[PDB]
Amino acid sequence: NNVTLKNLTAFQLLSQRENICELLNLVESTERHNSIINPERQRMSLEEMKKMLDALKN
Amino acid sequence: KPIKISADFNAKAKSLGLESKFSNATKTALGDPDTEIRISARISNR
Amino acid sequence: GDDEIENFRNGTPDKLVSDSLLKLKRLRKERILNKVLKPTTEERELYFKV
């Protein structure tokens, strides 16, 4: 916790610039997308549903 | 791509200008309990 | 000694005054730090050379 006016105003600018500098295609953020979709959590979770759905049939 | 963003927060700020604005207080050079001794010695010498 | 002779013969004495004034400022910043007084003999000799 312990947020202040400076810590908040400098967070709004960081969020606005992360988006603006991405519209101009100046930012490469592949080491952040390789934490959601690209990791095996997209496949291994499906490999857990593929067995929980079958365990739920008996 | 001249800008590289990582999962952490410090490097994300460092890439942009805000890098040093997430500190509660700006760094100092005269708060060192040694620098003040040297300055006081020079003043006492004068 | 020999420095002022070789220099004043080959010309360019400013290359010696400037270098000694730098060896005075550096040896003075190394004197205010770890505070001591009574400038060392090397600083006095360089001041005499300049």
UniProtKB/Swiss-Prot annotation, chain A:
Residues making up the signal peptide according to the UniProt record? none
**Organism's domain of life?**
Eukaryota
GO annotations of cellular component type: chromatin; nucleus; RSC-type complex
Query: Where is this protein localized, as stated in its record?
Result: Nucleus
Sorted UniProt keywords? Acetylation, Cell cycle, Nucleus, Transcription, Transcription regulation
Sorted alphabetically, the Gene Ontology BP terms of this entry are:
chromatin remodeling; G2/M transition of mitotic cell cycle; nucleosome disassembly; transcription elongation by RNA polymerase II
Disulfide pairs? none
Miscellaneous section? Present with 3550 molecules/cell in log phase SD medium.
**Subunit structure, per the record?**
Interacts directly with RSC8. Component of the two forms of the RSC complex composed of at least either RSC1 or RSC2, and ARP7, ARP9, LDB7, NPL6, RSC3, RSC30, RSC4, RSC58, RSC6, RSC8, RSC9, SFH1, STH1, HTL1 and probably RTT102. The complexes interact with histone and histone variant components of centromeric chromatin. Component of a fungal-specific module (HTL1-LDB7-NPL6-RSC3-RSC30) within the RSC complex.
Q: What does this protein do?
A: Required for cell cycle progression through G2/M transition at temperatures higher than 33 degrees Celsius. Component of the chromatin structure-remodeling complex (RSC), which is involved in transcription regulation and nucleosome positioning. RSC is responsible for the transfer of a histone octamer from a nucleosome core particle to naked DNA. The reaction requires ATP and involves an activated RSC-nucleosome intermediate. Remodeling reaction also involves DNA translocation, DNA twist and conformational change.
Please identify the protein, giving its name as recorded. High temperature lethal protein 1
Which organism is this protein's natural source? Saccharomyces cerevisiae (strain ATCC 204508 / S288c)
Q: Quote the range of the complete protein represented.
A: 17 to 74 of 78
Swiss-Prot record, chain B:
* Cellular localisation: Nucleus
Where is the secretion signal located?
none
Organism superkingdom: Eukaryota
Q: What does this protein do?
A: Catalytic component of the chromatin structure-remodeling complex (RSC), which is involved in transcription regulation and nucleosome positioning. RSC is responsible for the transfer of a histone octamer from a nucleosome core particle to naked DNA. The reaction requires ATP and involves an activated RSC-nucleosome intermediate. Remodeling reaction also involves DNA translocation, DNA twist and conformational change.
UniProt subunit comment: Interacts directly with SFH1, CSE4, histones H3, H4 and H2B, and via its N-terminus, with RSC8. Interacts with LDB7, NPL6 and RTT102. Component of the two forms of the RSC complex composed of at least either RSC1 or RSC2, and ARP7, ARP9, LDB7, NPL6, RSC3, RSC30, RSC4, RSC58, RSC6, RSC8, RSC9, SFH1, STH1, HTL1 and probably RTT102. The complexes interact with histone and histone variant components of centromeric chromatin.
Task: Please report which protein family the annotation says this sequence is part of.
Answer: Belongs to the SNF2/RAD54 helicase family.
Q: What else is known?
A: Present with 1990 molecules/cell in log phase SD medium.
Its protein name is: Nuclear protein STH1/NPS1
Organism encoding this protein: Saccharomyces cerevisiae (strain ATCC 204508 / S288c)
Q: What is the lineage of its organism?
A: Eukaryota, Fungi, Dikarya, Ascomycota, Saccharomycotina
Specify first residue, last residue and whole-protein length for the fragment.
157 to 202 of 1359
UniProtKB/Swiss-Prot annotation, chain C:
Organism's domain of life? Eukaryota
The signal peptide stretch is none
> What is its subcellular localisation?
Nucleus
Q: What residue ranges carry the coiled-coil annotation? A: none
Q: Any miscellaneous information on file?
A: Present with 4460 molecules/cell in log phase SD medium.
Subunit structure, per the record?
Component of the two forms of the RSC complex composed of at least either RSC1 or RSC2, and ARP7, ARP9, LDB7, NPL6, RSC3, RSC30, RSC4, RSC58, RSC6, RSC8, RSC9, SFH1, STH1, HTL1 and probably RTT102. The complexes interact with histone and histone variant components of centromeric chromatin.
Q: What does this protein do?
A: Component of the chromatin structure-remodeling complex (RSC), which is involved in transcription regulation and nucleosome positioning. RSC is responsible for the transfer of a histone octamer from a nucleosome core particle to naked DNA. The reaction requires ATP and involves an activated RSC-nucleosome intermediate. Remodeling reaction also involves DNA translocation, DNA twist and conformational change.
Protein's UniProt name: Chromatin structure-remodeling complex protein RSC58
What organism, scientifically named, is this protein from? Saccharomyces cerevisiae (strain ATCC 204508 / S288c) (Baker's yeast)
Q: Which gene encodes it?
A: RSC58
